[PDB]
Design a protein around this nucleic acid. Structure first.
Ligand SMILES: Nc1nc2c(ncn2[C@H]2C[C@@H](O)[C@@H](COP(=O)(O)OP(=O)(O)OP(=O)(O)O)O2)c(=O)[nH]1
Ligand SMILES: [Ca+2]
Ligand SMILES: [Ca+2]
Ligand SMILES: [Ca+2]
Length: 342
DNA sequence: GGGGGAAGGATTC
DNA sequence: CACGGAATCCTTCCCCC
């Protein structure tokens, strides 16, 4: 009987930038993360649709971006701001439901099984929310309403930007038949490829395959997940998940294997990590490194107690040494991550 | 046989 | 060319009932 409303903010980072600087509207905006290795090195965090239409999306080197739209506005990323803007919007969403699962910086699932009665009011409560967000914060969002969370997310996906969709029970049965598996939340490029080899192009194709051969390919959790959606019996609750890890990774001016060359970067990463922990004490720490060929390697340790800053500094090195010791590749990015809070 | 954690890796958004 | 934060899940190893 459950009704789920999913809210997703439009080209969020770029959009905040435009809210904070209204002149930018209508121009192509590209929020970037400058790695400083060389002039304009780094990547695209995101881009408004003005630039997205032309191929400038999250992940491309800012360099390839400048080649496509040499005259677009290129802003440095400012997480703290986007995060404080997300939060307030997120607090206005609580007015519509206590049952709210903040999935990420720009998404939230609201259980409206109560406050509403039908997709008529659902859809109207969507319009009340999309509009009340625009009023207060000046942010466009796309709403997705369906029987469960996954389908609420798909409804939003098909309706962005600034849209609102309702995939009722009629449509759900047609999506489980027509919807391209790859368009299902959780099926990225690697799981999409693996399922193709199994002849699984639709969620419905998942039913016609021995569960054991499906598990051995994508893992048990994914199988039961995809199987569940195929049978229209996926019905997971909404929970208010809490932070379980805090960390930061930075890029070096140039690759290295030298411990003293990498330290300043690792130490900076720790400082920000701690300034972010803010009152929370972690019992586990992980030094994370991206080797020059973009492979991610990491070494960590769990202590029976909380970690002080001074023990974080001392241990981080020890863990970094293990990495250079156990890997002959040059290091491109270095960072830390604190988990298992007290 | 199997609980449970810890560690390193894998994948997603 | 190619930044960055964090969650879920997998596999192997380990201790030990
Ligand atoms: N640094 C960085 N940030 C990202 C990346 N991908 C997404 N983000 C940020 C940028 C934001 O747009 C936000 C949400 O991204 P989404 O892909 O969910 O949607 P976005 O708002 O980018 O566009 P959309 O309205 O969904 O078409 O989180 C990434 O690859 N790197
Ligand atoms: Ca999103
Ligand atoms: Ca979005
Ligand atoms: Ca996909």
């Amino acid at each position: 009987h459950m009704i789920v409303l999913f809210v997703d903010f439009d080209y969020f980072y770029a959009q905040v930038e435009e809210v904070l600087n209204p002149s930018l509207k209508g121009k192509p905006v590209v929020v970037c993360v400058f790695s400083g290795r060389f002039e304009d090195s780094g990547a695209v965090a995101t881009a408004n649709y003005e630039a997205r239409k032309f191929g400038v999306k999250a992940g491309i080197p800012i360099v390839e971006a400048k080649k496509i739209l040499p005259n677009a506005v290129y802003l440095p990323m400012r997480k703290e701001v986007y995060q404080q803007v997300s939060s307030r919007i997120m607090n206005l969403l609580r007015e519509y439901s206590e049952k709210i699962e903040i999935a990420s910086i720009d998404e939230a699932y609201l259980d409206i099984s109560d406050k509403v009665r039908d997709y008529r009011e659902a859809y109207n409560l969507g319009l009340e929310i999309k509009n009340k967000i625009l009023e207060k914060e000046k942010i466009t969002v796309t709403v997705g309403i369906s029987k469960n969370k996954v389908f609420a997310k798909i409804a939003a996906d098909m309706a962005k930007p600034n849209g609102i969709k309702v995939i009722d029970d009629e449509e759900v049965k047609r999506l489980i038949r027509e919807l391209d598996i790859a368009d299902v939340p959780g099926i990225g490029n690697i799981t999409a490829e693996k399922l193709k080899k199994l002849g699984i192009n639709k969620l419905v194709d998942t039913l016609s395959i021995e569960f054991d051969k499906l598990k051995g390919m994508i893992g048990e959790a994914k199988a039961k997940y995809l199987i569940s959606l195929a049978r229209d019996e996926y019905n997971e609750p909404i929970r208010t998940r809490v932070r379980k890890s805090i960390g930061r990774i930075v890029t070096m001016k140039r690759n290295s294997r030298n411990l003293e060359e990498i330290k300043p970067y690792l130490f900076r990463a720790i400082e920000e990590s701690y300034y972010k922990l803010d009152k929370r004490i972690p019992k586990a720490i992980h030094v994370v490194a991206v080797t020059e060929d973009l492979d991610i390697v990491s070494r960590g340790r769990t202590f029976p107690h909380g970690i002080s800053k001074e023990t974080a500094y001392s241990e981080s090195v020890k863990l970094l040494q293990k990495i250079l010791e156990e890997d002959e590749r040059k290091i491109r990015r270095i960072g830390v991550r604190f988990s298992k809070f007290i």
